[PDB]
Design a protein around this ligand. Structure first.
Ligand SMILES: Nc1ncnc2c1ncn2[C@@H]1O[C@H](CSCC[C@H](N)C(=O)O)[C@@H](O)[C@H]1O
Ligand SMILES: [Ca+2]
Length: 331
């Protein structure tokens, strides 16, 4: 019944979320300029129209012929300016979102829009313009600031959301101008991480010594943990702010090591030997996929490397949160 245009499709978290919603619709087109991401997307959705094309090459005309009524989009935060000068409009690394805001008034068929964005977008000049273009085009909307930890998922991933909708379609949802911090539906307390952890985990995921020098700023998780830090694209590149670290050892054991390592030179030789025996390891791409609520049928190609995997995973969406917003957007 619904024709979806999936912009900045990435590895296709939106597509995964549309399925989880139970809603009637097809993805008629997914648009992304990243060849690796596209390859991952094609692997899981061989059937889906995937276009290696710039968002700015997308015309109202071609969007109209596709007969899309629904847009799913997660535009990245990219610059418009570098050290005093405007970035070029055909440089692939400049923000493309302004183009969308422009062409909105001529997307006559588009009825439903869902966008994910970074925390802080809601305070941006772009956001103010974007909302302003919605009102102009007779769209009604709700903005959210949601974390998966409120949707019963043991992970932090604070993101901005906007569910925008044409006002001539009856929307039962009691919207409001102030930002919503949690959905009306209560999911209770996030489950532990045991459901999503494998026993036969390869030693390649063990945190390396150079990394173990930065042990002081690691956030550690255990099987009983009901939370974890936000995974980024820099997970396993740097030790810090990039995501949580896991161990099978009791948290009490972890504390003794930290104490014993405190009576040593930081990042030191003796400092590292103590942390080496904690068996700290990264989450596997599979685990991160389960953490981000992708389905088990969803798998990654073995032809792409670990570093590629984590970069792609760090840019993706939580499938569960979007599925819940899709339900709200279409009620
Ligand atoms: N101008 C543009 N046209 C098409 N795709 C673009 C683009 N600018 C950035 N992108 C792509 O959009 C992605 C944004 S990250 C969001 C990806 C997606 N939500 C997922 O589940 O993975 C990046 O991977 C980037 O390759
Ligand atoms: Ca216009």
């Amino acid at each position: 019944s619904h024709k979806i245009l999936e912009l900045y499709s990435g590895i296709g978290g939106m597509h995964c979320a549309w399925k989880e919603s139970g809603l009637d619709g097809e993805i008629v087109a997914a648009v992304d300029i990243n060849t690796v991401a596209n390859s991952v997307y094609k692997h899981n959705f061989p059937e889906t129209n995937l276009l290696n094309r710039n968002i700015q090459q997308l015309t109202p005309q071609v969007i109209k012929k596709w007969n899309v009524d629904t847009i799913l989009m997660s535009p990245p935060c990219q610059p418009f300016t570098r050290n005093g000068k405007y970035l070029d409009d055909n440089d692939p690394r400049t923000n493309s979102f302004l183009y969308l805001i422009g062409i909105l008034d001529q997307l006559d068929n588009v009825d439903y829009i869902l966008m994910e964005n970074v925390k802080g977008f809601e305070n941006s000049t772009v956001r103010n313009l974007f909302i302003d273009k919605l009102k102009e085009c007779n769209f009604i909307y709700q903005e959210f600031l949601l974390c998966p930890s409120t949707v019963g998922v043991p992970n932090s991933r604070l993101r901005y959301y906007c569910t925008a909708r044409r006002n001539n379609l009856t929307w039962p949802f009691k919207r409001r101008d102030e930002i919503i911090t949690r959905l009306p539906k209560d999911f209770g307390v996030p489950h532990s991480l045991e459901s999503i952890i494998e026993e036969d985990v390869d030693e390649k995921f063990l945190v390396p010594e150079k990394m173990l020098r930065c042990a002081k700023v690691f956030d550690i998780c255990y099987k009983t943990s009901k939370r974890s830090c936000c995974f980024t694209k820099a997970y396993t590149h740097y030790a810090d702010g990039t995501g949580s670290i896991f161990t099978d050892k009791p948290r009490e054991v972890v504390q003794k090591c930290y104490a014993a390592a405190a009576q040593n030179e930081i990042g030191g030789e003796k400092f590292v030997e103590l942390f080496k025996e904690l068996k700290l390891r990264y989450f596997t791409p599979k685990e991160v996929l389960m953490i981000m609520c992708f389905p088990k049928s969803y798998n990654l190609p073995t032809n792409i490397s670990m570093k590629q995997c984590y970069r792609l995973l760090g840019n993706s969406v939580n499938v569960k949160v979007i599925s819940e917003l899709l339900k709200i957007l279409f009620e």
